[PDB]
Structures are given as C-alpha cells and as structure tokens.
Design a protein around this ligand. Structure first.
Ligand SMILES: Nc1ccc(F)cn1
Length: 330
C-alpha cells in the first residue's frame, strides 16, 4: 500500500501546512497539521466547547457508522508554545491520500486553548513522532504511521514542503523524481520519542563551513529554525541592523536588508536554505522591522529543525527497525 497527499501553507508566511484527511464512514474531510514533533491524532469535534470553535470543520462521531467510543480513555496534551487541548477518544477509519487505517484512535477535543481557536484553517493535528509520546490514558495509542506500517510497501514517509507553494506527504514509497542528486541518510535517536539526529555543522552565506555537532529534531509542526545561541549570533552578525529584541521575543532585522543563506550539514552533504526563506515579514502591519526565521533555542532546551530548514530539502522519515532520516537537495 501507498498514500499520497498535497500539503498547502495556511497563509503567505508558511506558518503551518494543512493536509486533507478523511475520517469516518461516510467520510468527513478535515484539514490537519501533520506534526513530526508530536504523537496524537486530535480533531475539533461536536464535543468541543462551542465558545472555543471559530470556523473550524468538526468531526461528528455520531454521524460515523464505524466510530466507537473508547470507554474510559482520556487525553491531554501541552505543546512547547504553551498551547494545549484535551478530551475523550474514539476509534474510526482514517485515510490519507488513499491509504486507509481501520481502528485508528481519533482524539476528540472537549477543550482547546486560544491559539487553536484563533487558527480557523487548522481542524486538528496528526502526530508523526514515535508512539511512546502519545497521551492517551490509561491505554496508550499508536500513531497513524505506526498503524499503517504493516501494509506499506516500504516503512517510510516523505515530507516535501513547498516555499509559498503546495507540497507533498508520501507514504510507503520514495519518489525518485522529487529530488536531485542522492539521499544522505543519518542516524536517529528515539530515546525522547522524536526524530532526533545530529547535524555536522553550518556555514553562513558564502563563509567557511564550521564542523560542529548540532543535536536537534526534525519537526514539521514547528515553523522556525531553533539553533544554539552561538550559531544564531554568527548568522545575525552578517545582517546589517539586526538585533535581538526582548519586546518582540527574538531577532528582528530591517525589512530592506538582504538575508544571507544558511547551510546545515547532513553527514558529508550540505543543505542550503535560501536567505529569502528566513524572512518572516513585518513584526506588525506597516512596520519596517521584520521577524527572523532563525532563532535561539536557549529557552527551549532542544534544537529544532522546523519548516524553515525542512522545506529546503526532500526529507525521508525511514521508520524501519533502526530508524534513519534522509535528506536530499531539491
Ligand atoms: N511540534 C509542535 C509544536 C507546536 C505545536 F502547536 C504543534 N506541534
């Protein structure tokens, strides 16, 4: 079995990507945020507090002939940005681009935090990290990828995110036409439940490459690139007028400046992120200060290779017995 689906940016800044998912019988299509930094499949539903729903498409388990309430099961999640959601759990049929999983745990949101209610284009999340992170109590549940793995031609999924344009999420196969050159594979550590790997270094613009180990996670659910203070300072020192702002909460730069590119190492291979991908536009409408896409991970505790880095490459998440990450230039 294989599955193929288009992922579309939610706004002109590429803040998040939505992918249509079919849930239940007859199918109810919801636009979900595919997140490799979490492991819960949760949706806005007929059970979510009415005041916390503003334009999202909801899942209605009562209208699904295949929906089963998982008796006594509850879930509760908290993300790195201080956002959260919780509720009860159902089992139902879930399909992504023609790939079907029966008996998938679908977490029905009863309470969602403000950042979710405010984001009317996102109907929920589809976690693609390892299942040890799933928050279903008292019986932990498997992710969509874990449930589909037996049926897949190859136990892999690929992320090919577009820059201001649509992209693709493929399951069960590698599209040899979606990248150039060869794929460089790197080791994954699953100890924290994430797709965790080690970058071999970096370069700023046309500068010399610095060989230094950078441990971080491949996260499609995070918009920006979060790197150690030293690395981030070295990058913004090359942008005239750039400074770190406590009021804004990170590095800002004059909107009229040209941003240098950022290179990260994958083994002996290099991935170049064009400077244009690092521009996140004005901090406020009309402002001449622009927000940077490369920020410090000092307050996070973990380095995150978010959408800013991933959209610059073809990314293979090899979920074989010993997991690996593949990167290729596109
Ligand atoms: N990995 C993440 C980070 C934030 C969020 F809202 C969802 N997923």
């Amino acid at each position: 079995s294989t599955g193929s689906a288009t992922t579309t940016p939610i706004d002109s800044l590429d803040d998040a990507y939505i992918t249509p998912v079919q849930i239940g019988t007859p199918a109810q299509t919801l636009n979900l945020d595919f997140d490799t930094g979490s492991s819960d499949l949760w949706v806005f539903s007929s059970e979510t507090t009415a005041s916390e729903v503003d334009g999202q498409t909801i899942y209605t388990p009562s209208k699904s002939t295949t929906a089963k309430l998982l008796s006594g099961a509850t879930w509760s999640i908290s993300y790195g940005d201080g956002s959260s959601s919780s509720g009860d759990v159902y089992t139902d049929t879930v399909s992504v681009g023609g790939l079907t999983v029966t008996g998938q745990a679908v977490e029905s949101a009863k309470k969602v935090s403000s950042s979710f209610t405010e984001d009317s284009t996102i109907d929920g999340l589809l976690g693609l990290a390892f299942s040890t992170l799933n928050t279903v109590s008292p019986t932990q549940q498997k992710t969509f990828f874990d449930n589909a793995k037996a049926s897949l031609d190859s136990p892999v999924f690929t992320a090919d995110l577009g820059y201001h344009a649509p992209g693709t999420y493929n399951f069960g196969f590698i599209d040899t036409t979606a990248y150039t050159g060869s794929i460089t594979y790197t080791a994954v550590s699953t100890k924290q439940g994430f797709w965790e790997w080690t970058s071999t270094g970096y370069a700023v613009g046309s500068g010399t490459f610095k060989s230094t180990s950078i441990d971080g996670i491949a996260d499609t659910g995070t918009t920006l690139l979060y790197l150690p203070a030293t690395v981030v300072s070295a990058y913004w020192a090359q942008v005239s007028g750039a400074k770190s702002s406590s009021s804004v909460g990170g590095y800002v730069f004059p909107c009229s400046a040209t941003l240098p590119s950022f290179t990260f190492g994958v083994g002996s291979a290099r991935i170049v992120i064009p400077g244009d991908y690092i521009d996140f536009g004005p901090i406020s409408t009309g402002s001449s200060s622009c927000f940077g896409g490369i920020q410090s991970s000092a307050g996070i505790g973990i380095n995150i290779f978010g959408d800013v880095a991933l959209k610059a490459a073809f990314v293979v998440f090899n979920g074989a017995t010993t997991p690996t990450l593949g990167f290729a230039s596109k």
